[PDB]
Design a protein around this ligand. Structure first.
Ligand code: HEC
Ligand SMILES: [Fe+3]
Length: 106
């Protein structure tokens, strides 16, 4: 999918997690977020269109998604342990990282 669609997937599923009734629901949402993060990582954002694909900016952009995936994986651990509230709180730790990338590259 294109970058905009993957961002909608991230945004929608964070809301799903916030509204979830059990940890399996959180797990399913996080799983979709993981996949959308890795698909987004393949994209070139508009603001870097005129930069080298090997530029430090593009590596930073890509690495931002690695870190999002790292957080998703830690929250998945909690979700798979049935810890719905902890897993929800861990998913909220994503938000600053959404914001930081947006500040740089949106
Ligand atoms: C870079 C490492 C990013 C991270 C991490 C996250 N987002 Fe993002 N997002 C990024 C860019 C470069 C853009 C602009 C793309 C463009 O074509 O203009 C966006 C945009 C969004 C949007 C808006 C989509 C739209 O059609 O305008 C949303 C709703 C969004 N991003 C959500 C989102 C969330 C919830 C994230 C953390 C879970 C997140 N993004 C991380 C780059 C990056
Ligand atoms: Fe972090």
């Amino acid at each position: 999918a294109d970058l905009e669609d993957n961002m909608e997937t991230l945004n929608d599923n964070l809301k799903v997690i916030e509204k979830a009734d059990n940890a399996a629901q959180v797990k399913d949402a996080l799983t979709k977020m993981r996949a959308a993060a890795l698909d987004a990582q393949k994209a070139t954002p508009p603001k870097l269109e005129d930069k080298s694909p090997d530029s430090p900016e593009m590596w930073d952009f890509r690495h931002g998604f690695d870190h999002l995936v790292y957080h998703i994986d830690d929250a998945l651990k909690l979700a798979n342990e049935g810890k719905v509230k902890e897993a929800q709180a861990a998913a909220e730790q994503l938000k600053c990282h959404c914001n930081a990338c947006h500040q740089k590259y949106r």
